[PDB]
């Protein structure tokens, strides 16, 4: 049965939203069935498969792809890692699932990058992202490469700006802008939430983070005072893509389909439906 496809995803609102399975034992409305292997406790490999319901921007894409490319799927949430990291020569998360042939595709908020592209193929990008900057309206900067960030002791008062550490933003900044990275560690933020308040309460002048995340939160700010820079200033621009197995027979049609969606306007509808906010 070559046309029923194992497909892996990962909870990450609003691209993928997981909900329980309600009254009737079936997924309804705009959601699709997705299974999750739910661990017994935190000290074990033991677990149980549980039927969940998934929806969101990427799920609508999956729905649109399934109807157009004509395939069916058993969708499941990855439990071993998140998006994907090489750990002790081994890929975990969604990437790994694809690499070790448990999934034909990964669908979710998965960033296209060089390293991953070595072991999986990617579709064309279907959401633009990269490293961006958020400020309180008024505050003047361009993107990451602004001197106010690179040499912040050239200006008075010096900018205060940070990121959420331990992720790809910090790691990119540390590899491209060593001193800026050294400088902003004292301004680190534990979460995206804490960063936004840090911005709103003047304890931070600039939040440096993932483009797609920042646009989304800016669209939903109570007061519309938190604003992201122009897209022309996004640094290390890239996109979310669907990961496929190297040399997959599906990539061409998935590519052509996604490009059809963009061309036809369907993608903008979707971004308006799920990502566009009031601001």
């Amino acid at each position: 049965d070559d046309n029923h496809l194992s497909i892996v995803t990962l909870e990450e609102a609003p691209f993928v939203i997981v909900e329980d399975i309600p009254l009737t034992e079936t997924c309804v409305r705009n959601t699709v069935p997705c299974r999750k292997f739910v661990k017994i406790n935190n000290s074990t490999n033991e677990g149980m498969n549980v039927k969940k319901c998934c929806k969101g921007f990427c799920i609508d894409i999956l729905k649109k792809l399934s109807r157009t490319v004509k395939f069916t799927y058993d969708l499941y949430l990855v439990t071993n890692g998140k998006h994907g990291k090489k750990v002790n020569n081994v890929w975990n998360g969604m990437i790994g699932e694809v690499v070790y042939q448990r999934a034909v595709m990964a669908v979710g908020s998965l960033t296209i990058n060089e390293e991953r592209s070595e072991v999986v193929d990617f579709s064309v990008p279907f959401v633009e992202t990269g490293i961006s900057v958020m400020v309180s309206r008024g505050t003047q900067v361009t993107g990451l490469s602004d001197k106010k960030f690179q040499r912040p002791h050239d200006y008075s008062p010096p900018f205060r700006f940070g990121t959420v550490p331990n992720g790809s933003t910090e790691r990119n900044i540390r590899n491209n802008y060593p001193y800026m990275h050294q400088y902003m560690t004292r301004f680190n933020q534990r979460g995206v939430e804490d960063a936004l308040v840090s911005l709103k309460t003047g304890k931070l002048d600039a939040f440096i983070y993932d483009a797609a995340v920042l646009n989304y939160k800016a669209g939903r700010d109570e007061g519309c005072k938190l604003v992201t820079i122009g897209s022309g200033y996004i640094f290390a621009t890239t996109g979310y893509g669907i990961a496929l197995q190297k040399g997959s027979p599906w990539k061409r049609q998935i590519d052509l389909a996604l490009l059809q969606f963009v061309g036809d306007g369907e993608m903008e509808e979707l971004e308006t439906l799920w990502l566009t906010g009031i601001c």
């Binding site: 296209i112 990058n113 064309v124 491209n176 963009v262 061309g263």
Partner: protein
């Protein structure tokens, strides 16, 4: 085998075209910020050697060094990007850079080449080396809201807007039946090249020019009697190869790496923002 024919097109700031000197070489010069301008010879339209430099030439050079291939560059003979047209009778045919790549007159398109379904049917695109989109250019003082403006949506010969003939934007408007009204206004006024359209706006012989923002925002920055709208559509430029290219994987890996280590940032600063 290892010597690639490169086709490209005149499109500032991604590609500059200038004459060679007397001795058939290129005048050495530096960027406003002091970087050496890398230049290559490029034959073009009857045909004659010229100088090419810019964003896409710098990208070609990094590709050529990274994957270790040699190259020869020429300008597309018909001056166009590439749309698909019925031959007349059954057979359809690509013009512009697309046709030259498909015919074998070129091995690789290095140019601000828009990625789209239409083209991706018949060729392999790399991952985007540039993300941008579509916007509108007007003389300062012309009042237009964007692609939904009534003077645009209910067109008449009293306000003329146009794009570049046999381009991705031409395709974009020909593509959807809801844009039908807009298209056979445009088809009556479309221009042979971006340069001639931009000029025609300044001369007030063209009221609005619909085109790539990475080009239009550059123009508006060098020419202050010109302004743009708002991106009404998002799209990317990619390297164009034939389906069988052994180079496709490494071209894309190279572009991703260049985004991630700030090489693209360097290029974007040098050419696209100034």
């Amino acid at each position: 085998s290892t010597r690639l024919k490169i086709v490209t097109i005149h499109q500032e700031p991604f590609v500059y075209v200038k004459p060679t000197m007397s001795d058939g070489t290129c005048k050495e010069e530096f960027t406003v910020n002091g970087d050496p301008v890398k230049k290559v010879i490029c034959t073009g339209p009857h045909t004659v050697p010229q100088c090419c430099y810019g964003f896409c030439i710098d990208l070609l050079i990094k590709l050529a060094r990274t994957m270790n291939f040699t190259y020869e560059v020429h300008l597309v003979a018909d001056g166009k990007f590439g749309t698909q047209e019925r031959v007349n009778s059954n057979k359809k045919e690509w013009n512009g850079m697309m046709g030259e790549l498909l015919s074998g007159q070129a091995d690789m398109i290095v140019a601000p080449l828009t990625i789209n379904n239409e083209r991706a049917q018949y060729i392999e695109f790399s991952k985007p080396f540039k993300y941008q989109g579509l916007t509108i250019l007007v003389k300062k003082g012309t009042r237009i809201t964007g692609i939904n403006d009534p003077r645009l949506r209910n067109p008449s010969d009293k306000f003329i807007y146009a794009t570049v003939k046999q381009s991705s934007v031409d395709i974009y408007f020909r593509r959807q039946v809801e844009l039908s009204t807009m298209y056979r206004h445009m088809e009556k006024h479309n221009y042979e090249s971006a340069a001639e359209a931009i000029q025609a706006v300044r001369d007030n012989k063209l009221h609005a020019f619909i085109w790539d923002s990475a080009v239009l925002e550059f123009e508006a920055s060098q020419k202050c009697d010109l302004v743009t709208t708002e991106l009404f559509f998002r799209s990317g430029f990619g390297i164009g190869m034939r389906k069988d290219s052994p180079w496709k994987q490494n071209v894309s890996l190279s572009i991703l790496k260049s985004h991630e280590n700030g090489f693209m940032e360097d290029l974007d600063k040098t050419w696209v923002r100034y």
